[PDB]
Amino acid sequence: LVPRGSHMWIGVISLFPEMFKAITEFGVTGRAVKHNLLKVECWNPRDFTFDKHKTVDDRPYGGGPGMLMMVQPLRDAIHTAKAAAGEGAKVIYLSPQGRKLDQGGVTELAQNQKLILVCGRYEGIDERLIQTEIDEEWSIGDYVLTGGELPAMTLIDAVARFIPGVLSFADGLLDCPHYTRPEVLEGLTVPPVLMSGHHEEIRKWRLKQSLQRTWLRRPELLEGLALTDEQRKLLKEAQAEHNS
Amino acid sequence: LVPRGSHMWIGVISLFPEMFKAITEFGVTGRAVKHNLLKVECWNPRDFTFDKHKTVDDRPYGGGPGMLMMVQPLRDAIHTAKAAAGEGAKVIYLSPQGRKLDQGGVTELAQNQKLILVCGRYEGIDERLIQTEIDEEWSIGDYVLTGGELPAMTLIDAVARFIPGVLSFADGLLDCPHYTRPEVLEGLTVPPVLMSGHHEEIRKWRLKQSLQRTWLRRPELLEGLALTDEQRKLLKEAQAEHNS
Numbered sequence: 001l002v003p004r005g006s007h008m009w010i011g012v013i014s015l016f017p018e019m020f021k022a023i024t025e026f027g028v029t030g031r032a033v034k035h036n037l038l039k040v041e042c043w044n045p046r047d048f049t050f051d052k053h054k055t056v057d058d059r060p061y062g063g064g065p066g067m068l069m070m071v072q073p074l075r076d077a078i079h080t081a082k083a084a085a086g087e088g089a090k091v092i093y094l095s096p097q098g099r100k101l102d103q104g105g106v107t108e109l110a111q112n113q114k115l116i117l118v119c120g121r122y123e124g125i126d127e128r129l130i131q132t133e134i135d136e137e138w139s140i141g142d143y144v145l146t147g148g149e150l151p152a153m154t155l156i157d158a159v160a161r162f163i164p165g166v167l168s169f170a171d172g173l174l175d176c177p178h179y180t181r182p183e184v185l186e187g188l189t190v191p192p193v194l195m196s197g198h199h200e201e202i203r204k205w206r207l208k209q210s211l212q213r214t215w216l217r218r219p220e221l222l223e224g225l226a227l228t229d230e231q232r233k234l235l236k237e238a239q240a241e242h243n244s
Numbered sequence: 245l246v247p248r249g250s251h252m253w254i255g256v257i258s259l260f261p262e263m264f265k266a267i268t269e270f271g272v273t274g275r276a277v278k279h280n281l282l283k284v285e286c287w288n289p290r291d292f293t294f295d296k297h298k299t300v301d302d303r304p305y306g307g308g309p310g311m312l313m314m315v316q317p318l319r320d321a322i323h324t325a326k327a328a329a330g331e332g333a334k335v336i337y338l339s340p341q342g343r344k345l346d347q348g349g350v351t352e353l354a355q356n357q358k359l360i361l362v363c364g365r366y367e368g369i370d371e372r373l374i375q376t377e378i379d380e381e382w383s384i385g386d387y388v389l390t391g392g393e394l395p396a397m398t399l400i401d402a403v404a405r406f407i408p409g410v411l412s413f414a415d416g417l418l419d420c421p422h423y424t425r426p427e428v429l430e431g432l433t434v435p436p437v438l439m440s441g442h443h444e445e446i447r448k449w450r451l452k453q454s455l456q457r458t459w460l461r462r463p464e465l466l467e468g469l470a471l472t473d474e475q476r477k478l479l480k481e482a483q484a485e486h487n488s
């Protein structure tokens with residue numbers, strides 16, 4: 001009954017599929033799953049092992065302190081996910097060596113109706129599997145985590161927001177400050193304009209604050225933008241008041 | 245019995261504390277928790293409400309489509325976490341408007357023995373709470389998620405790796421490719437040097453590959469580095485071979 005149509009299917013390859021309950025069972029993403037706007041399906045390489053101890057790691061050629069994902073169980077899990085996905089599924093590997101995710105990249109990834117996310121553990125996966133099985137390698141940021149599961153979940157959450165029905169950044173700026181009750185909090189008052197009921201004055205104040213915040217915190221983000229006439233004016237005003 | 249000492253305590257304020265099972269119950273972080281190297285303690289603003297329906301959101305002054313976290317339950321939850329933490333706990337708010345996390349920032353945050361992480365939902369929290377309760381505002385990347393929980397979990401995982409006992413980036417470079425069995429995979433062979441047993445040749449090959457990979461994928465990362473004599477040489481060699 002809930003209108004889908006732009007529903008999204010996401011296959012996940014992970015040694016710890018139960019981690020994905022954090023997004024499939026709670027909040028907005030949990031609702032998206034319940035309403036069939038989002039489907040997350042997990043395959044565990046451990047289920048594709050054949051030895052008694054269900055071995056899923058293997059030693060790197062050339063030595064070193066780390067292990068890699070064992071090729072055969074991982075490869076078989078990926079092939080099974082691909083078979084379930086059918087035609088048109090893009091296979092994504094999350095790693096610190098990948099293309100850096102930003103909101104633009106999220107909107108690009110969100111254009112896919114089917115994704116398969118491969119979650120590496122240990123020191124990652126065999127380079128030849130990346131060559132033969134992986135379409136795109138992405139990073140959620142310049143830091144190292146214990147597995148690709150949190151990055152995969154982060155990507156799912158980010159793209160889920162663009163699925164119709166699931167739900168100032170949209171303009172490439174940081175957001176303005178927001179206020180709610182009470183009118184006075186530890187001596188700090190709400191900006192009078194927000195309680196004026198003057199919608200146009202409130203819009204312009206918020207936009208001016210967003211411009212000022214972006215300039216002060218992330219000035220490089222401004223360089224990437226072609227500001228509107230109005231934005232140029234409000235930013236100039238904010239900068240003048242800062243130097244005043 | 246497991247040596248701790250540099251153990252870390254992390255308080256979390258979240259409307260969905262059960263999401264944090266994804267890190268406290270599984271993998272390396274799950275082991276860290278079991279071994280008392282890492283403690284994660286959650287407070288839910290819903291438990292600090294007094295009305296019949298346990299209301300945790302509130303309307304923004306000045307209108308708009310979104311809601312904010314209700315101040316009183318959130319504020320009381322934060323104060324309770326602070327009381328439990330005692331002296332010296334840094335309070336962190338995760339938002340897209342915060343300082344961008346990278347590995348350097350992770351190592352800085354990891355110097356804290358106590359952290360409190362505040363997870364915003366809806367359109368975030370009252371600006372005056374950020375002023376009065378929050379020490380530092382951090383972002384895990386330039387994208388928007390449905391809540392601060394995945395960013396909080398991402399930060400916990402990243403900093404947990406620096407807790408002694410819990411466990412090429414360390415040099416500011418991307419990692420080299422790695423290989424494991426089989427020797428031939430879909431016609432693709434393992435680089436002969438990795439099966440040569442010549443440790444010095446293998447080290448230099450890996451370093452050269454890391455330099456080449458960083459140059460090709462993330463050249464800006466190289467600008468931030470003062471390369472060693474050896475790194476300058478191997479990078480020059482890799483670049484020469486690319487133009488050859």
Ligand SMILES: CN(C)c1cccc(CNc2ccc(C(N)=O)cn2)c1
Pocket residue numbers: 094095096120121122123124125138139140141142143144145146147148151419
């Ligand atoms: C070489 N190595 C340690 C490694 C290689 C691949 C995957 C993993 C799993 N960890 C991840 C994955 C992604 C990210 C990210 N920033 O998107 C951070 N951590 C580790």
Ligand SMILES: CN(C)c1cccc(CNc2ccc(C(N)=O)cn2)c1
Pocket residue numbers: 175338339340364365366367368369382383384385386387388389390391392395
């Ligand atoms: C204004 N707004 C929508 C908002 C404001 C604050 C928090 C939140 C919760 N969502 C988050 C949190 C952090 C990150 C990050 N990149 O670290 C991404 N999403 C949303």
